[PDB]
Ligand binder design. Structure first.
Ligand SMILES: *C/C=C(\C)c1ccc(-c2ccc(N(C)C)s2)s1
Length: 133
């Protein structure tokens, strides 16, 4: 299924600090952020997506259309400019962010009741699982 609509509560988080280290997020921010449970709110209509990642410590929102390249400032994440593109590979939603960092982006897919996410930067992969609320 390509339907990722929902409010998604984090169940599992693996190597989040490795991914943040690869982005060069400062020590104090990484040490606080790694402790925290996350929420992911996805609003999906056709190719139009609105995605919000939240914790008690951050709020990161992005809007995009599948298959339409967009230039992006990554704002309070790591304050970098990238050229982003989100596409479907089967039922995996794939984001590539072209810029200074290699292998940067993410992948999301549905397994039954749960949303699975990979966040990638450099040689680091963070793996997350969310449950549908
Ligand atoms: C599809 C998933 C996306 C776009 C994101 C998942 C996590 C973030 C994020 C983690 C930390 C952030 N800040 C701002 C410290 S943002 S985005």
């Amino acid at each position: 299924t390509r339907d990722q609509n929902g409010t998604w509560e984090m169940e599992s988080n693996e190597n989040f600090e490795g991914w943040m280290k690869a982005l060069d997020i400062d020590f104090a921010t990484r040490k606080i952020a790694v402790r925290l449970t996350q929420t992911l709110v996805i609003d999906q209509d056709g190719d139009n997506f609105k995605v919000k990642s939240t914790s008690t410590f951050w709020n990161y929102d992005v809007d995009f259309t599948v298959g339409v390249e967009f230039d992006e400032y990554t704002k309070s994440l790591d304050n970098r400019h990238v050229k982003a593109l989100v596409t479907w590979e089967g039922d995996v939603l794939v984001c590539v962010q072209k810029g200074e960092k290699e292998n940067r982006g993410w992948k999301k897919w549905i397994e039954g009741d749960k949303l699975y996410e990979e966040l990638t930067c450099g040689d680091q992969v963070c793996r997350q699982v969310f449950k549908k609320k």
